[PDB]
Amino acid sequence: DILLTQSPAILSVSPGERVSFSCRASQSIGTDIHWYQQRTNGSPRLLIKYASESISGIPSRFSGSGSGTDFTLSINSVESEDIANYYCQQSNRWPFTFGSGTKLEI
Amino acid sequence: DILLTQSPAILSVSPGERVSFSCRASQSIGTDIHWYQQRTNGSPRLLIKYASESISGIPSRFSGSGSGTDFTLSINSVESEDIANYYCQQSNRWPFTFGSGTKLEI
Amino acid sequence: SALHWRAAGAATVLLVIVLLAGSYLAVLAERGAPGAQLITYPRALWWACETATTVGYXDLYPVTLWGRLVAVVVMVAGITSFGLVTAALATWFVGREQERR
Amino acid sequence: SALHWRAAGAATVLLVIVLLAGSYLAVLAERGAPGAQLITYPRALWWACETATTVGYXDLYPVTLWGRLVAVVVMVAGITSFGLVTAALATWFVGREQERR
Amino acid sequence: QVQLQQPGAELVKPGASVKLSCKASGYTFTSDWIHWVKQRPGHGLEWIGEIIPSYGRANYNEKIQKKATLTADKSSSTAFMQLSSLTSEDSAVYYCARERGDGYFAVWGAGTTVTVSSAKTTPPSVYPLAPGSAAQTNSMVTLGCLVKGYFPEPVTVTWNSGSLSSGVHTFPAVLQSDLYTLSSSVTVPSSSWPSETVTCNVAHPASSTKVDKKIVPRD
């Protein structure tokens, strides 16, 4: 069962800077990775699907890249509304699995 | 995205000696590796393509070998005109990528 | 029109159907098996295509008993169909050229 | 000369064309997809050949939607062609031996 | 004949935009891809993106912010790269290279130096550097010219239109108060000067101003 590792668990960045979260798959999964956002008291929100594809309704600030076992979700110029928990999820092999999580802190 | 690692970054050798630069791929890429030379203030120059194939107009001094994830560019009896930066590049999988670079010093 | 000509087209419509039901049934069967990769419809459809044609690259294949049975049906449907078009082309060529005499 | 004989050759010229356009279109479609390996013409041509014949070893396969569609066309063209030559050989053998009676 | 021709330099103000070009020559096939590689000073090569002229499609590096947009013009055989909303970060040398759809970069462009500053263009001041009257000489003599007060980079200094490349040194520029400065040196057989002229050709692309300067002995 594919193990997704997210490190670090907490990321601290200065307003407007460029932040990058990373997901590590325990085995090649193509680009079958997707990213979610969960603010406090909220439910997950799909941000990027298939590692790079952008979702409709998401700031052009959010982007993703990677393939194989190494993936990255970036935020060009982070801002307050971005303070939350980011998770990755793979659909390469059954059963689907989730990353441990990364908290963004400004 | 294939990560090409070149180590060491600086290679020091005695005139006429035999030097060897190495490129490490983060995953098997066949022999889909190519080498470039860039002297100071100059632009890259293809030296070897497909890991072993020699290019026309390049001293018979230059040679390459390897396959899979380990590749080597050698120079039999190095000389002054060889002082420059050497880079490897892979065409195995998209997107093409470049090695960090190695400087030859005499 | 002509039997062979109709049976061929019928074989083609039937193929498309098997291809789609194949995609559905494959995912239904494979989902639930650890390590299974034939688990989303879009790629399962592409799996069905390369199976029916028999090019089987693999990049995707079933691993559960029911997935394999679904695979067996798609294989046979594709082979039968592609084989029913060859016989229709032979009937056309024979019956025709027979006049060119 | 004879219909079947002409349709066969026409199927062969058409094949070669699909093979070349296949190589071009495959690279055009695959380039831009992370991890894609069908990205240089020489190997894409070899991919086309092993696909049209259906031997699909895999060592290379498309991963984008348009690459797969291009693959589907090459498969069918190759199968149709190779199948149009079998029907031409059957028409030749039948019509001929029919005299040997 | 230089396969790919690119403008030597481009200056852009932060937030502004510039469109680099690359004119190709030699054979041209439907299977040609033009690539753009970005190199920051002291650093390595970074693939930016690619475009296929015959079809007009382009792909870009996902691992980095997309400042570039690729377009091609079949008639004039030129590939363009539109860089937008620049900053000091987007300052470097941009190369274009051609690939015959087989994976390696056969030929490269000289590269276009791009600078992102609020400064103002400024041609370089060229001055001679002949020995001092009391400077005894050996079998060789050293001369040179001083290029200073220019902006932005770069400047291409040659000696006698390149026919004297041997024995030449062109030190790296030094930035100060928005004006670079560098010096070049040459060493010809002492007895060959000033019998045989020794001039210093200095070209400053960013301002379209080439200037020579003969190097004769002092009074």
In chain B, residues with a C-beta closer than 8 Å to the C-beta of E44 are: 85, 87, 98-101
CA distance E5 to E97: 10
In terms of CATH architecture, what is C1-57? Answer: Orthogonal Bundle (1.10)
Question: Under an 8 A CB cutoff, do A65 and E62 touch?
Answer: yes
Provide residues of E within 8 Å CB-CB of chain D. 30-31, 33, 50, 52, 55, 57, 59, 62, 101-103
Contact by Cβ (8 Å): C27, C38: yes
Domains of chain E: total: 2
Q: Is C35 on the interface with D (CB under 8 A)?
A: no
E184: domain CATH number is: 2.60.40.10
Tell me the fold of B1-106: Immunoglobulin-like (2.60.40)
β E18-24/E4-5 pair status: antiparallel
Residues E127 and E104 placed together within one structural domain of the fold: no
Q: What are phi and psi of E56, to 5 degrees?
A: 85, 5
Peptide bond into E194 cis (omega under 30): yes
Question: Under an 8 A CB cutoff, do B89 and E35 touch?
Answer: no
Residue D86, phi-psi category: left (phi > 0), alpha (psi -120 to 50), beta (remainder)? alpha
CA neighbor of A72 nearest in space, from B98, D36, E65: E65
Rg (CA), chain E: 21
CA distance C59 to E150: 59
Q: Is A66 on the interface with B (CB under 8 A)?
A: yes
Q: Name the closest residue on chain A to residue D63, using Cα atoms.
A: A30
Closest residue to D34, CB basis, from E52, E57, E62: E62
What secondary structure, in 3-state letters, does chain A show?
CCCEEECCCEEECCCCCEEEEEEEECCCCCCCEEEEEECCCCCCEEEEEHHHEECCCCCCCEEEEEECCEEEEEEECCCHHHCCEEEEEECCCCCCEECCCEEEEC
How many residues can be counted in chain E? Answer: 219
In chain E, residues with a C-beta closer than 8 Å to the C-beta of B94 are: 59
In chain C, residues with a C-beta closer than 8 Å to the C-beta of A29 are: none
Contact by Cβ (8 Å): B45, E45: no
In chain D, residues with a C-beta closer than 8 Å to the C-beta of C42 are: 65
Peptide bond into A59 cis (omega under 30): no
Q: Name the closest residue on chain C to residue D61, using Cα atoms.
A: C57
Domain residues for E1? 1-118
| Domain ranges (residues) in chain A | 1-106
Please tell me what DSSP assigns to residue D12.
Answer: H
Neighbours of C95 (CB within 10 A): 12
Residues E78 and E181 placed together within one structural domain of the fold: no
Q: What tokens appear for E152 in the block?
A: 């932005």
Q: Give alpha helix (H) positions in E105-184.
A: none
Q: Is E47 on the interface with B (CB under 8 A)?
A: yes
Q: Is A1 on the interface with C (CB under 8 A)?
A: yes
CA distance D81 to E80: 43
CA D101 to chain centroid, in Å, comes to 38
CA neighbor of D60 nearest in space, from D30, D76, D40, D37: D37
Q: What tokens appear for C21 in the block?
A: 């039901």
Please tell me what DSSP assigns to residue E169.
Answer: E
β-bridge mates for residue E89, sequence order: none
Residues E86 and E3 placed together within one structural domain of the fold: yes
Q: What are phi and psi of B76, to 5 degrees?
A: -80, 105
Residues E52 and E136 placed together within one structural domain of the fold: no
What does each C-alpha distance from C16 to A79, D81, E27 come to in angstroms?
50, 20, 46
Q: Give the determination technique.
A: X-ray
**Reported resolution, Å:** 2.8
